[PDB]
Amino acid sequence: VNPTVFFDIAVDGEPLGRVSFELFADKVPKTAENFRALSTGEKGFGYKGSCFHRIIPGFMCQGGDFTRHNGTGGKSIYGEKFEDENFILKHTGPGILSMANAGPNTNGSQFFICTAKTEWLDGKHVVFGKVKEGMNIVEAMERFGSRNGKTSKKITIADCGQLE
């Protein structure tokens, strides 16, 4: 069965709520496994304690840099970077979970959650999951973003792990 992972989001240390994701291990197993493992922290590093460094209202929320914490870092469980698995899934609407990158075959740990349909990204970013529960929490996170993506408050992943 496709795994389920959760993020407990905090704003300036205050609990905001929980967002759960279904990871499409059936279509993009390598990419899904990377995100799952980084969520549990089983490899010794991962998302817990990292922040969402770029939030653009009406577009997406981006995070995952747990190494440099300034938007340029992150790494995968397979090494520094890994290849684009496939582009079977599309950015069809709000709740889509997809990989950020710096060009072809540069996936690390950074990801983004879409809050709208984003067709232009199809074929450039690997879609590997979707919000299962807590879309209202993602919508609340958008309130702290801006055009440039800079956040007004510190939005962190206070806790994370695998549910199912």
Ligand SMILES: CC[C@H]1C[C@H](C)[C@@]2(NC1=O)O[C@@H](C[C@H](O)[C@@H](C)CC/C=C/C=C(\C)[C@@H]1C/C=C/C=C/[C@H](O)[C@H](C)[C@@H](O)[C@@H](CCC(C)=O)C(=O)N[C@@H](C(C)C)C(=O)N[C@@H](Cc3cccc(O)c3)C(=O)N3CCC[C@H](N3)C(=O)O1)[C@H](C)[C@H](O)[C@@H]2C
């Ligand atoms: C008139 C406004 C316009 C835009 C707004 C936002 C809007 N509509 C609009 O009409 O967008 C639309 C959606 C658009 O149609 C979309 C789908 C297409 C147009 C794309 C817009 C993209 C953006 C506004 C932002 C711009 C951010 C640029 C950031 C640049 C960084 O300086 C640079 C990327 C840097 O951080 C380097 C550092 C390298 C190093 C080792 O030092 C880098 O490569 N960083 C990577 C990390 C993973 C390492 C990174 O962050 N990569 C980005 C690259 C990227 C940049 C732009 C477009 C891409 O497809 C991809 C990345 O993967 N993401 C994830 C996807 C979004 C993107 N950031 C982003 O923030 O994209 C939505 C539906 C809605 O209507 C809103 C209002």
